[PDB]
Write a protein that binds this ligand. Structure first.
Ligand SMILES: Nc1ncnc2c1ncn2[C@@H]1O[C@H](COP(=O)(O)OP(=O)(O)OP(=O)(O)O)[C@@H](O)[C@H]1O
Ligand SMILES: Nc1ncnc2c1ncn2[C@@H]1O[C@H](COP(=O)(O)OP(=O)(O)OP(=O)(O)O)[C@@H](O)[C@H]1O
Ligand SMILES: O=P(O)(O)OC[C@H]1O[C@](O)(COP(=O)(O)O)[C@@H](O)[C@@H]1O
Ligand SMILES: O=P(O)(O)OC[C@H]1O[C@](O)(COP(=O)(O)O)[C@@H](O)[C@@H]1O
Ligand SMILES: O=P(O)(O)OC[C@H]1O[C@](O)(COP(=O)(O)O)[C@@H](O)[C@@H]1O
Ligand SMILES: O=C([O-])C(=O)[O-]
Ligand SMILES: O=C([O-])C(=O)[O-]
Ligand SMILES: O=C([O-])C(=O)[O-]
Ligand SMILES: [Cl-]
Ligand SMILES: [Mg+2]
Ligand SMILES: [Mg+2]
Ligand SMILES: [Mg+2]
Ligand SMILES: [Mg+2]
Ligand SMILES: [Mg+2]
Ligand SMILES: [Mg+2]
Ligand SMILES: [Mg+2]
Ligand SMILES: [Mg+2]
Ligand SMILES: [Mg+2]
Lengths: 528, 528, 527
């Protein structure tokens, strides 16, 4: 009502109050400055360009929420040191819960993939595959660490039997195309159709093939155990084809790994086909557009993205958009017009998380890349048409008898009614926060938890801002609850989420332990 | 399985109103408690203590006393019998049904005199005949088929030649030929059988009458003195009329609900300003259907009900709803349809006049309104209604308003059997009712008057709590909540395994409602 | 803009342009006068009160479109007299051959029903059945025309067996309730639970019983042959319980009766159960609330009504709302508040036709009952929320490869874009008009036909105004088409449907014969 005239001209609120989508579009305003904290989480792949403690400190300040460790590269020893560095940088800000941001760690698996070998000049070297040249693809292990511009080793022994003369071999998410001329004892003699810069251990994709490949290799098992031992938060499971891939991963993690979240990467035609069964048994999904867009026609990937994000939004499960989002920023300080558009559109499509790969793992501007995802996402989030979104989730979602579910829809609705600055929720596992996130409030969901791991893992859900509460239980449980709510309000103040006289929605439960969230309260923020 | 086939839920799921209509099913039994209150006019057929007990059991919520007829003593008698009948059930507080008492004013009505042959005589007014309309005192008790006396003395200076004079629910029509010293010489345009003291209507004649007459002031005084809950104020033409009623009621009468009756053209014209200053509205279809064309009344009804639904204020549909049941045991097909459509239009209350005041079947008239309303309430298209009311309601920083919408949203998500709310004045209950939930709003109150008055708001079931305050206020709050659930179970509104939403406040006194909770109803008598 | 902003204040146009239903209600305005011609057709039942040529003429002036003959009453001879008087009244206006109104004739069957006998005194007489008294229900032929306050005859010979002791016999749409005390040789001796005034030949309804009645009795077959031989337009087929019932009717009408519309009456529980298979093989539906309201619980009838009209509107097939709509006007000059509201809500529910029974058949105010239905229907039509109704039909209905379908939706959309005063359609059978009527245009459908029967029959679909074209062909077909269209336009001007400067939509076909409608044009009304 009377927060000010100015209030209703900010954060695209004229567009928010449109009666149609079309009218909503027409009312978008470049001069309407975003106000809410950026809610879509940024995942940054950690490699040579992003490994130092100093650099990780600036990536955290720029907006990094989740660090991705790609086990298709490096080694256990390398990734262990990456983790050490991440945790040093993260904990450097723990001095005062004023700038303390949890950072989650994700292990991205190799999975049923085909990779090239390490070049002659070593794992950080490159060679130029030239258009028109002859290239031998070999399976002879003597070439495993001795690849160059003429001979490429591959780790799938059976390629020779499986690829046809005149057939294509693609390298590095389709960067390089080889056409098979001849088959024989030496391997596959190819001509380079499209050339480029080949690095070490690059992905190999084979059109017109149905390679049966284990699913969990012996290396995969070592990698998941490494994950459990180093207490990673998330598994990004590569090339999930079917439900049983997800269950195999859940099995190998074991009961000690039971709390680790599994985000299934959809990277091929089969995964898209079996999406429903995959999503059912997964904690969430990654639209892995690098592999996907060379496994399926490039012009079709956007249908897959929009569909999978839609379905995850409906299921209330985290979804990640990935790969080539700000690609040009590997060598330039500013992105292309298509790249800003792609990020904005991933937020508008409804992604919980967006991701940087080469842009942060090996590029010249890792910090700028994080900064740019931050700035775009914050603008896109203000432009979501919540009215239609919320209305469509009501119409489409099932009825629920779960009291936390019921509480969360009422809490979010209440947050719109009064333009609440935040919804403060107590959560042991993240779940009560996740169930608020699914209705996409404009209000920040501030999740207060004692669980360090839950604080990291809630970054998967758009708009959940974790606060690690560190005080030991009060003598009286009601007083412990109150102190945690007050903690959320005061961190809200000091982080600029709240000010005296804002309204907040508070979501609690009626007893200790998980699953008893059933209370929604409306509070005015005051001084003491 | 069976659950989803009742309460017209197949029709409730429909994607369009059209498909909703197509899916309505006569075999789908309502299960909700009846939410549209029944106002029964009390008179000869309905004032014995025994009859009134049967009428309470049939569903009567509000007793109307029509002060167009009967002495003060006759009305005081009716009140004592109503209170006796009501209080006969008070030895069962979990089942006790409050009954409100409404005083309907005489207002500026015009009536004919007594006939020569006295108050049981009747005379034929023949069409084509000349009849004088006189205000000569000597004709007050000497009416015949050629002279009719009228109690509006100023009628002879206010009805110009060519003016129409309607008598007895508009069934007799006179057209003025001349204004003489003897009065209005007229011609019978429509004829009929005329009795004593019959209502007169003067449409397209602006009357001089005061608004509050000396009798009205006596009658409003009587109202305060006998602690009536509601004034139905006859012939409200403008906002100043409403304020005159509020002033006469005095400081003693401040809490009495004023429901303005819209009975003529000017009242429709000035509806908006009238509704502003009133607690609610009655579509008084009897007078209105003579004052304006009969074939336009349905537009005024639907307009007024809509605007009231928009304002979150109670609206009453009245007059001739089950008219035939004055003499017959079963109503006409038009009459059942009238009742159902009043509910579907959005009426909070429906009314019975002659059918309960003087007819042969008062109890069965009440039973019939009960049964129809139940069927119609199940058939309301909530999906559309809820959205349109959500969207039309303004943003609010008032926590009662914020919590109300969260609780109704929540009710809909779990198909909650009830919303239980504590209220001192009825307001927190009204703010739920205004979103038209399918769930029953069980209002728990210590105030006997509020318990009576909340019957004006659709879907509010008052429970009068009688226990002395617990020493700890939170305990007192909890006892009332558990009392609401236990009354709910006993009256069969709630069964074990149902979810209820509970609505409470953070301190004592009106205006601090701010908490919504989700409970399960257990077999046990304490719930969580 | 340049219609004059007075145009956007009449006809409930502010309410028409609401964004929501709720806003639409809030904008309804009693000072906003209707301007369109009344589109919901009025069916009047013809009996004692409506027999004379002068009376029928007045009923036609008041707005009667269909005359209903109830063969549960009278005799062949009686209805032949009625028909002759209806046609003489109808043809008395053929003088000015564009103020001629076709009037359809509907034969309403007995069907599988039970009825009481003729009283002592004859079919004009009445007796009071007194509450508490003892009444004998008998199957003895000697009481067949000898009924009184104490013995009532019924034409279901096997009634002694189907009704238990302590079971209810309802008479005249539930007006009278009898409870069976004892079962014996004379019949059933009953005590009167609810009394009332009994006439001759009143409906008997038996709750919690099954009766074995054929579907088409020997009398039904005689009555349908009568209908064919007297060139009736419509059969209102009583107590349609299943799809086979409709097909039997269609069989009995035979090749001679091919073009007669069957409107199936839904009046009991089985009929509601089997609605979908009945509507499928029927030309239309009647919601027969008299019987229906004593066969099922009275508080349920409104659900059945709204469901059935909703489904008919979706199937694009005409539906009639019937019985007790203006009941009090049997004795009173003015209706009750419930009655006006009922008529309005029938129209707002989407009924194509509204009906009068006793109000015109036997009451004191037949003409004023018709006038009242006319007045209400006209107000209610302007209050339809076209915006939502069109949208939901578009969403709900199937796609179609039929050129007439495709053209109709186009035409109606075009009618809205320009506020066309009329859509003019050429039709042989009415089908092309009907397919426009299903989208409920605010614009009048002026249907130009050479078929007198079609011109009577199209009254069944809301918004269709028939113009019977009388001229003989032109050498060139295309010239004949253009003259029929010109007839439409000049007829609309004269009747005040149209003025110079109105737009009209014109719907035509590419060749003669039925089934080839496929053209829509936008014309300015000339000179
Ligand atoms: N830990 C690392 N050490 C060295 N180089 C790395 C590391 N992580 C990533 N890279 C480099 O950055 C590139 C892009 O990273 P990204 O994580 O997308 O891997 P990818 O090879 O495309 O496989 P995926 O399909 O799993 O994304 C890699 O191809 C590799 O050249
Ligand atoms: N042709 C007629 N001759 C004499 N009286 C008639 C005739 N038609 C109708 N009536 C009178 O009007 C009443 C109502 O007319 P209506 O056509 O509704 O008949 P009904 O008995 O109600 O049977 P249905 O269930 O077919 O309507 C009849 O019961 C009868 O008293
Ligand atoms: O989101 P989750 O994991 O269900 O946890 C929410 C739980 O948190 C609480 O607010 C607090 O529980 P604790 O005191 O055990 O932290 C409970 O009332 C509620 O059931
Ligand atoms: O509906 P109202 O009149 O505002 O009353 C609601 C009030 O009832 C309560 O729930 C209980 O108050 P009391 O103990 O004064 O009855 C308050 O917490 C709340 O403000
Ligand atoms: O509505 P129906 O019976 O299908 O009639 C539509 C027919 O009327 C016409 O406009 C004219 O046909 P006729 O010339 O045979 O009268 C045809 O073009 C069209 O197929
Ligand atoms: O694996 C990925 O991240 C991809 O392929 O996009
Ligand atoms: O006073 C009334 O209730 C009326 O006139 O309808
Ligand atoms: O038969 C009828 O017309 C009825 O019963 O309503
Ligand atoms: Cl009786
Ligand atoms: Mg990988
Ligand atoms: Mg790859
Ligand atoms: Mg990649
Ligand atoms: Mg990949
Ligand atoms: Mg009064
Ligand atoms: Mg009145
Ligand atoms: Mg019949
Ligand atoms: Mg009838
Ligand atoms: Mg019938």
């Amino acid at each position: 009502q009377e927060l000010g005239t100015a209030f209703f001209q900010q954060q695209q609120l004229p567009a928010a109050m449109a009666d149609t989508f079309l009218e909503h579009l027409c009312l978008l305003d470049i001069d309407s400055q975003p106000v809410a904290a950026r809610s879509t989480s940024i995942i940054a792949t950690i490699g040579p360009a992003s490994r130092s403690v100093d650099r990780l400190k600036e990536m955290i300040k720029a907006g990094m929420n989740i660090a991705r460790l790609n086990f298709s590269h490096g080694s256990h020893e390398y990734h262990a040191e990456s983790i050490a560095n991440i945790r040093e940088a993260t904990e450097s800000f723990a001095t005062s819960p004023l700038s303390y941001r949890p950072v989650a760690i994700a292990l991205d698996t190799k999975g049923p993939e085909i990779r090239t070998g390490v070049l002659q000049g070593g794992p950080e070297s490159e060679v130029e595959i030239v258009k028109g040249s002859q290239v031998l693809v070999t399976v002879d292990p003597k070439f495993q660490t001795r690849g160059d511009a003429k001979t490429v080793w591959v780790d799938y022994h059976n390629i020779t039997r499986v690829v046809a003369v005149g057939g294509r071999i693609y390298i590095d998410d389709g960067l390089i195309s080889l056409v098979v001329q001849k088959i024989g004892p030496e391997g596959l003699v190819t001509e380079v159709e499209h050339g480029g810069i080949l690095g070490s251990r690059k992905g190999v994709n084979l059109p017109n093939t149905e390679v049966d490949l284990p699913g969990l290799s012996e290396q995969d098992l070592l990698d998941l155990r490494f994950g459990v031992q180093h207490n990673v938060d998330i598994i990004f499971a590569s090339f999930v084809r079917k439900a049983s891939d997800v269950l195999a991963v859940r099995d190998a993690l074991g009961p000690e790994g039971q709390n680790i979240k599994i985000i299934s990467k959809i990277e091929n035609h089969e995964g898209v086909k079996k999406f429903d069964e995959i999503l059912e048994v997964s904690d969430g999904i990654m639209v892995a557009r690098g592999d996907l867009g060379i496994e399926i026609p490039a012009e079709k990937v956007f249908l897959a993205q929009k569909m999978m994000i839609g379905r995850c939004n409906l299921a209330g499960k985290p979804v990640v958009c990935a790969t080539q989002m700000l690609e040009s920023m590997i060598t330039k300080a500013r992105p292309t017009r298509a790249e800003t558009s792609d990020v904005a559109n991933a937020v508008l499509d409804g992604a919980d998380c967006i991701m940087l790969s080469g842009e942060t793992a090996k590029g010249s501007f890792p910090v700028e890349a994080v900064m740019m995802q931050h700035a775009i996402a914050r603008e896109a989030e203000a432009a979501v048409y919540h009215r239609q979104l919320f209305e469509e989730l009501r119409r489409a979602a099932p009825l629920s008898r779960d009291p936390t579910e019921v509480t969360a829809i009422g809490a979010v609705e209440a947050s719109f009614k009064c333009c609440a600055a935040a919804i403060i929720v107590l959560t042991k596992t993240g779940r009560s926060a996740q169930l608020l996130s699914q209705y996409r409030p404009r209000a920040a969901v501030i999740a207060v938890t004692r669980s360090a791991q839950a604080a990291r893992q809630v970054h998967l859900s758009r708009g959940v801002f974790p606060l690690l509460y560190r005080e030991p239980p009060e003598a009286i449980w009601a007083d412990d609850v109150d102190r945690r709510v007050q903690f959320g309000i005061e961190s809200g103040k000091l982080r600029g989420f709240l000010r005296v006289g804002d309204l907040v929605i508070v979501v609690t439960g009626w007893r200790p332990g998980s699953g008893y969230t059933n209370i929604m309260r409306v509070l005015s923020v005051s001084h003491h």
